[PDB]
């Protein structure tokens, strides 16, 4: 009965001072509402970083720091790095339950681009035993985030078959992500040439079997 | 130091009952209650209470009140969160967490449930090599697919879990009312086919586990 | 120094340290002993009768005693304090109205006692002459080096202190003074007894539905009737009265 607000997202670069508030939708944010901040880095990986208002929990670089600033509690990162970039959510306590803001998603300049490293492998035989034939596209250790996977069977654009997962966040804070194209054991033998097409922060990188 | 392993991610059809365990290392069990966050796919975090694990009295949040029990085997460190008759909107991750220091200190791994109606199909695995031809780079790409599950999770490791470096583990994706995951594996050229590289597949659903040897293709 | 609720404090009762109970206009000589909860006399530690320590806030003010007033229908005279207690020469007065001020404020309290001064003898004075004959008086001596009667001080129970439960920005938190035992939990279910530094509060959010207590042991008081019962025991504290009624010739 209470409402915890965040900002969105926030951008910054390695080397500033950044920000995060949290308000309270009832009142001025106090030292007894003992607000929390907490961090969420990609594999639904949470770590606390403040509690009781400015208490850094022990193992946090102290270039997090919290506060109260006005009527809301704030957490600053003076020195942002790279690897802050993630998800801050901030809690808030009354007097009975915990109330969690939206979160804030930081996003800190750094990690020099990175292009995808891609793999096609071919419908395995005992796969093939099965009348059925799958083409795996992997791809990994991409940065950006964003790439664009498309198929060509024989020269032409596959367009129904493929099946391209999310891009998901890997350690290292690059991401992965891999593409299906299922065929049938006869589609297989059929066609001759498969190429899997990934687009990546501009360049193209094709890698093509050959049945 | 404080370790707080939660277990794996179920699949349960609307109405069951599901037990989430929360192992808790490296403090005094005693001295630090646990809280509950729900993290649903959209909507952000949640508090759904906390127990106290000196007395075994929990909070429940009202939004939690009713289908949701906290209990603890406090003789081993655990703390469990139980949602019985499932409603298939309860689908989500849950994790559990450590109130200390005005506030919550450390958080677990997490436990997604996916509510989902579906019979139980069994995992085909299979090898990825290289492509028939030449190969010859300072490294080489494996791969291993399994194809066809229900419901999740399937566990997947490298050489019996000693293979862990260079490897890309791709989440399940749900296609045609089955899951599909995948797995890339990267070593230096001289160690595959040299050495044996095996991909280790589980799904405790189906009491299924192979073990596939990754192959030449010639 | 005990604090207890004075009846007519100014405005109304209010609950002032030097809340007057034993009023004892018994005696002949003008005099009255009466006992604040305050204990003035030395400092909390060690130095100087004449020094003044009641209790504001949970805690003492161990300072000077410059502006003391015990009154009746007329201003007192101060005959001397030790301890809780305090003589003070008055006259008759259908009630009893004590003070000091602390600089701030004038911070006194007052009490209904039927007082009288008869002096002994077969003359029925108003107050006490210059000259006369001398003859066996019923009074009180001005000294503490006095053991001829002692009443229980056992321990304070808890006391109230709100400022404790401040919010933790949406639960209602409680603090401790300095460690001190603070027994705690709300009308709502969360932490039943309270043997704690600082807490928090879970479930209740509300100041107004919450124990703010103070077990706070480490000094006995005066058995005053406006205290109430520290629940655990009989403590000991058997403490002596300096002003005993003696057997002056006024």
Redesign the interface.
């Given at each position: 009965q209470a409402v915890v607000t965040q900002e969105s997202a926030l951008t910054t670069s390695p080397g500033e001072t950044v920000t995060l508030t949290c308000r309270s939708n009832i009142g001025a944010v106090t030292s007894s509402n003992?607000?929390?901040?907490?961090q969420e880095k990609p594999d639904?990986?949470?770590?606390?970083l403040?509690?009781?208002?400015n208490?850094r929990?022990?193992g946090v670089p102290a270039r997090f720091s919290g506060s109260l600033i006005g009527d809301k509690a704030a957490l600053t990162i003076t020195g942002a790095q790279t690897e802050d970039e993630a998800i801050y959510?901030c809690?808030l306590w009354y007097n009975?339950?915990?109330?969690?803001?939206?979160?804030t998603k930081l996003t800190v300049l750094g990690q020099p681009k990175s292009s995808p490293?891609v793999?096609?492998?071919?419908?395995?035989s005992?796969?093939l035993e099965?009348n059925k034939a799958?083409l795996?596209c992997?791809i990994?250790d991409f940065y950006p985030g964003v790439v664009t996977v498309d198929w060509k069977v024989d020269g032409t654009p596959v367009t129904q078959g493929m099946?391209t997962?999310q891009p998901?966040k890997?350690s290292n804070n690059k991401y992965?992500?891999?593409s299906?194209l299922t065929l049938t054991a006869r589609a297989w033998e059929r066609h001759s040439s498969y190429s899997c097409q990934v687009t990546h922060e501009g360049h193209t990188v094709e890698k093509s079997?050959?049945r | 130091q404080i370790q707080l392993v939660q277990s794996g991610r179920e699949v349960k059809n609307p109405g069951e009952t599901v037990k989430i365990s929360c192992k808790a290392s490296g403090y005094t069990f005693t001295e630090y209650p646990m809280?509950w966050?729900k993290?649903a796919p959209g909507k952000?975090?949640?508090?759904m209470?906390?127990i106290?694990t000196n007395?075994g009295?929990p909070?429940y949040?009202?939004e939690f009140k009713g289908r949701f029990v906290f209990s603890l085997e406090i003789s081993a460190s655990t703390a469990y969160l139980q949602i019985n008759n499932l409603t298939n909107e309860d689908t989500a991750?849950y994790?559990c967490?450590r109130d200390?220091?005005?506030?919550?200190?450390?958080?677990?791994?997490?436990t997604?449930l996916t509510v989902s109606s579906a019979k139980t199909t069994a995992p085909?695995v299979?090898?990825?090599?290289?492509?028939?031809?030449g190969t010859t780079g300072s490294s080489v790409?494996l791969?291993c697919?399994v194809?066809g599950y229900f419901p999740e999770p399937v566990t997947l490791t490298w050489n019996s879990g000693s293979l862990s470096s260079g490897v890309?583990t791709?989440?399940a994706?749900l296609?045609s009312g089955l899951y599909?995951l995948?797995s890339?594996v990267?070593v230096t050229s001289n160690t595959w086919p040299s050495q044996t590289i095996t991909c280790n597949v589980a799904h405790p659903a189906s009491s299924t586990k192979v073990d596939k040897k990754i192959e030449s293709?010639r | 120094p005990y604090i207890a609720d004075c009846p007519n404090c100014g405005h109304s009762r209010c609950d002032s340290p030097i809340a007057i109970e034993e009023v004892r206009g018994d005696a002949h000589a003008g005099v009255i002993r009466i006992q604040t909860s305050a204990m003035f006399g030395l400092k909390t530690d060690g130095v100087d009768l004449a020094y003044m320590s009641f209790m504001n806030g949970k805690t003492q003010k161990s300072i000077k005693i410059d502006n003391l007033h015990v009154r009746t229908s007329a201003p007192c005279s101060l005959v001397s304090h030790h301890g809780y207690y305090i003589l003070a020469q008055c006259p008759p007065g259908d009630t009893v109205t004590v003070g000091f001020h602390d600089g701030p404020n004038r911070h006194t309290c007052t009490v209904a006692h039927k007082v009288e001064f008869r002096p002994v003898g077969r003359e029925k004075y108003r107050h006490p002459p210059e000259h006369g004959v001398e003859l066996p008086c019923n009074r009180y001596t001005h000294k503490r080096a006095d053991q001829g009667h002692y009443v229980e001080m056992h321990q304070p129970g808890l006391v109230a202190d709100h400022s404790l439960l401040s919010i933790?920005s949406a639960k209602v938190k409680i603090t401790v003074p300095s460690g001190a035992q603070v027994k705690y939990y709300c009308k709502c279910?969360?932490?039943?007894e309270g043997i704690t530094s600082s807490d928090?509060t879970?479930?209740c959010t509300d100041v107004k539905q919450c124990r703010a207590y103070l077990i706070d042991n480490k000094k006995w008081v005066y058995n005053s009737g406006r205290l109430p019962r520290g629940e655990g025991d009989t403590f000991k504290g058997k403490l002596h009265v300096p002003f005993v009624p003696v057997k002056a010739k006024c």
């Open positions: 003992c607000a929390n901040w907490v639904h990986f949470f770590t606390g403040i509690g009781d208002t208490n929990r022990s959510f809690a009975n339950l915990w109330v969690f803001g939206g979160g490293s793999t096609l492998f071919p419908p395995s005992e796969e099965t799958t795996v992997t990994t099946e997962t998901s890997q992965m992500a891999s299906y079997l050959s | 809280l966050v993290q952000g975090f949640r508090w209470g906390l106290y007395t009295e909070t949040a009202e991750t994790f967490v200390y220091f005005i506030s919550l200190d450390y958080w677990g791994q997490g997604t085909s299979y090898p990825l090599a290289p492509v028939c031809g790409t791969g697919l194809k890309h791709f989440p994706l296609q599909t995948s890339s990267t293709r | 933790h279910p969360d932490v039943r928090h879970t479930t």
